[PDB]
Design an enzyme around this catalytic site. Structure first.
Site, PDB file in Angstrom:
ATOM      1  N   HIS A  40      32.937  43.451  43.600  1.00  0.00           N
ATOM      2  CA  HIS A  40      32.128  42.986  44.708  1.00  0.00           C
ATOM      3  C   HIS A  40      31.324  44.100  45.394  1.00  0.00           C
ATOM      4  O   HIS A  40      30.560  43.839  46.316  1.00  0.00           O
ATOM      5  CB  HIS A  40      32.972  42.196  45.715  1.00  0.00           C
ATOM      6  CG  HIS A  40      33.959  43.019  46.474  1.00  0.00           C
ATOM      7  ND1 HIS A  40      35.289  43.100  46.123  1.00  0.00           N
ATOM      8  CD2 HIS A  40      33.830  43.751  47.606  1.00  0.00           C
ATOM      9  CE1 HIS A  40      35.935  43.841  47.002  1.00  0.00           C
ATOM     10  NE2 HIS A  40      35.075  44.247  47.912  1.00  0.00           N
ATOM     11  N   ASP A  84      38.461  41.833  39.918  1.00  0.00           N
ATOM     12  CA  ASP A  84      37.585  42.526  40.837  1.00  0.00           C
ATOM     13  C   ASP A  84      37.609  44.023  40.502  1.00  0.00           C
ATOM     14  O   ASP A  84      38.220  44.830  41.213  1.00  0.00           O
ATOM     15  CB  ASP A  84      38.063  42.254  42.266  1.00  0.00           C
ATOM     16  CG  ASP A  84      37.093  42.742  43.315  1.00  0.00           C
ATOM     17  OD1 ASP A  84      35.955  43.134  42.971  1.00  0.00           O
ATOM     18  OD2 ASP A  84      37.478  42.733  44.497  1.00  0.00           O
ATOM     19  N   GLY A 175      34.945  48.639  54.471  1.00  0.00           N
ATOM     20  CA  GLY A 175      34.432  49.978  54.248  1.00  0.00           C
ATOM     21  C   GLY A 175      35.315  50.722  53.261  1.00  0.00           C
ATOM     22  O   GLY A 175      34.927  51.770  52.740  1.00  0.00           O
ATOM     23  N   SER A 177      36.801  49.090  50.467  1.00  0.00           N
ATOM     24  CA  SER A 177      36.671  48.449  49.159  1.00  0.00           C
ATOM     25  C   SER A 177      36.298  49.396  48.035  1.00  0.00           C
ATOM     26  O   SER A 177      35.431  50.248  48.198  1.00  0.00           O
ATOM     27  CB  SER A 177      35.635  47.336  49.206  1.00  0.00           C
ATOM     28  OG  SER A 177      36.232  46.098  49.525  1.00  0.00           O
ATOM     29  N   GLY A 178      36.947  49.215  46.889  1.00  0.00           N
ATOM     30  CA  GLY A 178      36.682  50.050  45.733  1.00  0.00           C
ATOM     31  C   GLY A 178      37.504  51.325  45.712  1.00  0.00           C
ATOM     32  O   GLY A 178      37.616  51.971  44.677  1.00  0.00           O
TER      33      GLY A 178
END
Ligand SMILES: [Ca+2]
Ligand SMILES: [Ca+2]
Lengths: 223, 54, 54, 223
Positions: A40, A84, A175, A177-178
């Site tokens: 995402h 994801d 902030g 994410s990933g």
């Protein structure tokens, strides 16, 4: 990161910042030319920032490299958030040093109760907003699948795991994410989603990396 | 209408700059979107938001 | 849902203190209502708003 | 009032402020014991403030009197805004002086083009918010019914009139409701509604007072 602490400049050398004029997602350096992040977080024209601590001040010891290609997992479902995961190839290889290092991929999954290190530059308030300049860290254990499933009925797949505290107060947030969830020197998770942040009985949900190591290897070798 | 819904971050944890139409101010304003979910009052640019909601 | 609609003043010109549920902050916040029209995310007290939207 | 000017302390002696802990609507004193306002301003436990200029500072020369009864017009339609008029009886009669005076009710209606004085403590920005401390005034002419009908297709009844400027920039606004529209020393309108404030081709819509003088007299005499 809500309820975390300042990591310390360059103590998490595999942590990268994804930038498109501003930091929008985190990621992990798996080798000198590949970064793992969340699906995402996909975007066109991404600049990867390595050796970063204060994302607002360029100290001159960072490495800014453009992404040449972002490969999202072929079975990513934007509705379910299943699979994801995304791989990003750097236009040029990062110069690995004391500030820039890769993190190892897992061969075995981690069990419930394992303490892992989560990091990012996301919101530090579970209520309202407050984005940090420097990298924040949080120590959190992996929850049991039953605890996870009960906190998110019908939402957890076999490619997801919950980590954090059911009492709330400590969690990853917008902030982050990933970003990496590293347990015992291995990359076991990727920050993905959750209901709010640091909410009681709503822990963070992460992508179960150990299930994707083959795909990662196949993709890296074929690109 | 899509333009009357409040700006929604969603459950994902990214901080992507997006636009939504603010009925009170009568114009499009930016917000940070988590990357998944949310609602239809969510546009890529201020211009697109205005073309649809202005 | 009523709790996701933005706070609407309406076309009337009074400035009556009302409450609406702010999804971003996750709680009820006050706003000035014009006295007519608007939408359902409009409550008399913060307590009523919370009983319905909290 | 958007685009108006500071009236001057006590230059509009018939102007009253309706208060329920804070100013919410305006009104006009028609005699020592009756106030005319808008129906949508109806509330329980209203304190009427007379001789007021700075609504935020009590100067000690004002008169604060509680409403004993608020009589809304029997045919007020909250959906159409038709018959948007209400009468408020004061618990005790106001002391009429240099700062507190009544305004005359009309015997004849006013024609299009007549310049009237509109006043209130409402928002002064047509964009955003900015509420004044002191009473603002605005001179605006009554528009022709055709101009009014075209600006608000299907919305104007025989009990409403438009006043202001089609170019926008000057209009009444939130916080002005119930206030006076006085033309040639006569009360001809009550601030009611409009699309936004000071918007081009969206002038203010006011209650046509000349159509209600009998009702007003009948009600006052019967209460
Ligand atoms: Ca820096
Ligand atoms: Ca005063």
């Amino acid at each position: 990161i809500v309820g975390g602490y300042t990591c310390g400049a360059n103590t998490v050398p595999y942590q990268v910042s994804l930038n498109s004029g501003y930091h929008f997602c985190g990621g992990s350096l798996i080798n000198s030319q590949w970064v793992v992040s969340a699906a995402h977080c996909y975007k066109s024209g991404i600049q990867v920032r390595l050796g970063e601590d204060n994302i607002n001040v360029v100290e001159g010891n960072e490495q800014f490299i453009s992404a040449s290609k972002s490969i999202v997992h072929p079975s990513y479902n934007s509705n379910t958030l299943n699979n994801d995961i995304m791989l990003i190839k750097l236009k040029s290889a990062a110069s690995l040093n004391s500030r820039v290092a890769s993190i190892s991929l897992p061969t075995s999954c981690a069990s419930a109760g394992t303490q892992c290190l989560i990091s990012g530059w996301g919101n530090t308030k579970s209520s309202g907003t407050s984005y940090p300049d420097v990298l924040k860290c949080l120590k959190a254990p992996i929850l049991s699948t039953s605890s996870c499933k009960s906190a998110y009925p019908g939402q957890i797949t076999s490619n997801m795991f919950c980590a954090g505290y059911l009492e709330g107060g400590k969690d990853s947030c917008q902030g982050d994410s990933g970003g990496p969830v590293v347990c015992s020197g291995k990359l076991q998770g990727i920050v993905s989603w959750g209901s709010g942040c640091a909410q009681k009985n709503k822990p963070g949900v992460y992508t179960k990396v150990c299930n994707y190591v083959s795909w990662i290897k196949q993709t890296i070798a074929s690109n | 209408e899509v333009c009357s819904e409040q700006a929604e971050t969603g459950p994902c944890r990214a901080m992507i700059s997006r636009w939504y139409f603010d009925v009170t101010e009568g114009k499009c304003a930016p917000f940070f979107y988590g990357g998944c979910g949310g609602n239809r009052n969510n546009f890529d640019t201020e211009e697109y938001c205005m073309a649809v909601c202005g």
